[PDB]
Design a protein around this ligand. Structure first.
Ligand SMILES: [Cl-]
Ligand SMILES: [Cl-]
Lengths: 450, 123, 123, 123, 464
């Protein structure tokens, strides 16, 4: 069918023409696409370096060449918050954005430097971010902002743009993937602005990820092998069977998620992508200009209150086109993301101390990180804090499940495996000071003021 | 001497019996032989006090569910499993104080908490 | 003239829609053609008021159950069917006043009355 | 468990043309029931030897005296000591000598509970 | 394995004129064939030849032939399980009449209608013989030649020693058991009953469960038997849906046997329970030549599919584990000159196993006529299907909760679960499902009409 077509200009009512071109190229390779175990072997001992087999923190000369980029296009709507996810409170008054800025201040003050802090926004988050940013006026911090691409959603049945006009309402548009960094850095001018200041290196991170802290040893290791791309990897726990993993397919290392599922084994294929990515800013400038990008397109279907396709890209995809792309195997303290109020309970717990805008785990914690499974009555932050106003003691916890309307009193201690299931319709009030260990708790109990 | 776990397969409870009677094992020359396709270690099985007696265990679980792909199972209260039930990932089933749950034959349960009270009677 | 029933196949309710979207029929030159292996007549289907609107019917039955071998299906109250449910013979499902029944994916229900309450939550 | 254990000795016996002695350490709770059930293995080429472990008296916590008055005091006031009573029981019963007389130099010890405790020639 | 030896030697318990040497021999022969597998090459349905349509049969027998018939009823079964003490046959069915009463009334008629005297034989067991000897006295003075005999008393085998459970001959009733319905052949013979019937010119016996109300002498089937010199006919009726378990007729090779699901492998079972292709099941209404029976036992060509049952019997202690091993009357069909089966209407299969069956048989669906239950001629469909739950198991409980039998002409299907009480003059039509909520009672008001409905919950009706 091919079906040439295309809103040649929408309204065409400045550049924008530039973004639409990048879209038409994702659309073309979509119609052509709709997997292979050729040399899908595990990664070689060279292409995954142990963090413990690195030395020597970088100098200051090198640190003066680093910029920090945080993905900040995401809304807080899954945790029932309006506005950007980064503005959500994490602990002791501090948001994700607050902790990130505090981290740049400490670094700046410790080494007498001024590391630029760059925020990639979207039309959902840029403006809210412009307003909240003002609270960091006065602190010695260089905050730069840019907007990623705004692509039109495709109607599934007509396969035409959902928007008629340029000023068609925000329902018919979407921000593409995390992989839109490359084109957005460039098209916005941010790439040049950083180069003009002698930035050669960027450390890229989700605003979600409390543990993505500048590490001078991995900055050294990068430059002292002129590798243009490093990916932090950590180790699959049972909680990570999903999500991308590193593969040495041919000699050119790639990574994959998708028969062609024996890799679900924690043995054989044992490391996954944190999305903590270090890159050469110069490498990024050419791969964009030589049009050598062409990344695995991902197509998502949704329903705009009309059914549509999205079509996005992933930052992991690009790894092929980079002069010595390998990966580094880091402790889990560098992968501490917050996607749900389950993650919030962990991160606010007695398991962590706040030091210079970083979460520091209790050195007495025996095992790995406790697994926490809260039900839908804890989905909204406002509901989570109504029901769990004081975070239980969870050193010695392995596993927690809570379903239905459950309220925890102050200074509750959880050990081992704990399952609490409130009866359909009923509330359970767990008394203050309760010690629960290796138990299933069930029923319906109210505690009222006498 | 540090031996594989196939040499440590003791049976202290009807939880252990559910493991040992499952599709995870074949009987060969009076030995239990584990499925070579089993991905991880041995599934963890936590049955409550309504399964303590062998006679009760077999009244409620007359046909052993399919438990390759199972990591974790908890069942509390009066729960009956139909034939050819498949359990994957983590599965928690909690019958309400006093109530029975009849899990329909052929049910596929994966990474879920199941709760309530449901009877299945012959029409 | 006294015609076979294949010439009377009206669609007045979402009950009729469940029949006509099922594995009982193939689309051939713009005609619905019944499976030639179908033993009896057309199955009788009654869905209650929670299935009146097409939007509600598809929220609760997103994947049409397998109904060759079905004679009689009645469903009352808030009932959700998982994917690849098989119904045979007579099946009666009655949710308790105010409650939901989630029928697990893969359930085979044959010649049975199902009654009560059951929630299946993502872990 | 006993059936699987005997089947394991038969296979071994048949595979290597040998007759490995199979010894059961009983207690006053189990010796007699075991004597009766053992009879079903008559006919199969299997050397089944039986012995009884120690029967010690329970100490009353307050008097710190024996709970039993007589030797024929009821079975409530006695108990079989630990699994560690093998050494003294092997010896005192004569089983230790009986095995030595047959050129047994080695014993492989196991819980009847443990399905996976199979003779391993490498170890 | 040998091992036998110990059994054979132990079978000299013989702890007095009348002996049982004969029975023990018949046992040792069942024990030997047991130790063999201690398969069936799934290879076809029955030929058009080995199944005659009752509607494709020729006229009623003469009187000459009727003077050659004897009637035998299986009467070893207790009423324990319907919570009744003594033999099932003594339980009241309707309007004051027991199973035995209806059977005798049937012979009295028949005798009077044809001026004959058909012998009526009761096969008892040590559980039922003595109670039946006492009850049978009430038929003194009516017509009817009533003969009784006792079946075999075999010893239960200890599972672990494979020796007899009884030490003495006077060891208590716990260690012994009456074998199957298939013990007829050896019991007829060993008791002398076979000869006594032959001496009176019987030639043919019609065999039946006492509990099957519809197993009535049929002159057309008596003719068809003799007027084809067939030595064995089995009545078959049609599998409905409540019948999938229990024997069906098979033309294995060129002859006829039948397969009960017990002797069928793990797979294929699903093709064997198809209501199409197999079509028919065994009523246990069996016609046989008494002469055929005399040789098959004497030439020792019996060898019937052995059925092995496990139990736990009690002294001063607890319990010990045993095998039974019985035989089925259906099994023998192989050894009989022109063994076929006849496809009879369902009115000839009306058994009473549960209080569900009692509700049917006491209902307005049936009238009592010359000791037969006769269905309302206006009844549209087949026999209604009735399922009552555990609160209706014992006769005493059934009558506490259903004192006045509901009107069930126009009923297709009734199921009742939990504590349900019916008021007087309740009418049930179509499909009715009643489910009391766990722990609760439903009182259905007097005069209720329930049609094509599910009734669920709780309802109490209290005297003001
Ligand atoms: Cl007698
Ligand atoms: Cl006589």
């Amino acid at each position: 069918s091919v079906a040439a077509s295309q809103m040649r200009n929408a309204l065409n009512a400045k550049r924008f023409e530039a973004e639409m071109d990048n879209f038409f190229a994702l659309f073309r390779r979509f119609l052509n696409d709709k997997v292979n175990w050729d040399r899908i072997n595990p990664p070689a001992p060279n292409q995954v370096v142990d963090y413990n087999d690195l030395g020597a923190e970088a100098s200051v000369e090198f640190l003066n060449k680093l910029a920090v980029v945080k993905l900040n296009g995401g809304l807080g709507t899954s945790m029932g918050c309006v506005g950007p996810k980064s503005v959500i409170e994490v602990r002791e008054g501090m948001s994700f954005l607050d902790l990130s800025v505090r981290q740049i201040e400490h670094l700046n003050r410790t080494y007498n430097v001024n590391v630029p802090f760059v925020l990639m926004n979207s039309f959902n988050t840029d403006q809210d971010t412009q307003s909240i940013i003002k609270k960091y006026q006065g602190h010695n911090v260089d905050i730069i902002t840019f907007n990623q691409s705004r692509y039109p959603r495709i109607i599934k049945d007509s396969l035409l743009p959902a928007p008629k006009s340029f000023d068609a309402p925000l329902q018919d548009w979407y921000p593409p993937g995390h992989g839109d960094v490359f084109e957005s850095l460039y098209n916005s001018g941010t790439l040049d602005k950083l180069l003009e200041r002698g930035v050669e290196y960027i450390f890229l991170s989700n605003a979600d990820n409390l543990g993505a802290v500048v590490d001078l040893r991995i900055l050294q290791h990068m430059a002292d092998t002129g590798a243009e791309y490093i990916m932090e990897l950590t180790d699959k726990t049972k909680a990570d069977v999903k999500g991308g993993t590193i593969i040495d397919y041919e000699g050119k290392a790639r990574l994959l998620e998708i028969q062609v599922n024996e890799f679900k084994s924690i043995k054989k294929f044992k490391y996954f992508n944190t999305n903590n990515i270090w890159m050469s800013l110069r490498a990024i400038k050419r791969v964009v200009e030589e049009n050598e990008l062409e990344m695995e397109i991902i197509a998502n279907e949704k329903s705009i209150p009309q059914a549509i396709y999205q079509l996005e890209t992933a930052v992991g995809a690009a790894i092929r086109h980079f002069k010595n792309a390998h990966g580094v195997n880091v402790p889990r303290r560098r992968f501490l993301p917050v996607k749900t109020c389950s993650d919030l309970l962990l991160v606010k717990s007695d398991l962590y101390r706040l030091e210079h805008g970083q979460l520091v785990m209790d050195p007495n914690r025996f095992g790995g990180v406790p697994v926490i499974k809260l039900g839908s009555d804890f989905k909204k932050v406002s509901d989570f804090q109504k029901r769990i106003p004081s975070i239980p003691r969870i050193v010695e916890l392995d596993h927690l499940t809570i379903t239905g309307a459950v309220n925890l009193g102050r200074n509750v201690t959880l050990k081992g495996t704990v399952i609490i299931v409130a009866t359909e319709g009923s509330t359970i009030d767990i008394p203050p000071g309760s010690v629960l260990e290796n138990c299933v708790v069930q029923g319906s109990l109210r505690i009222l003021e006498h």
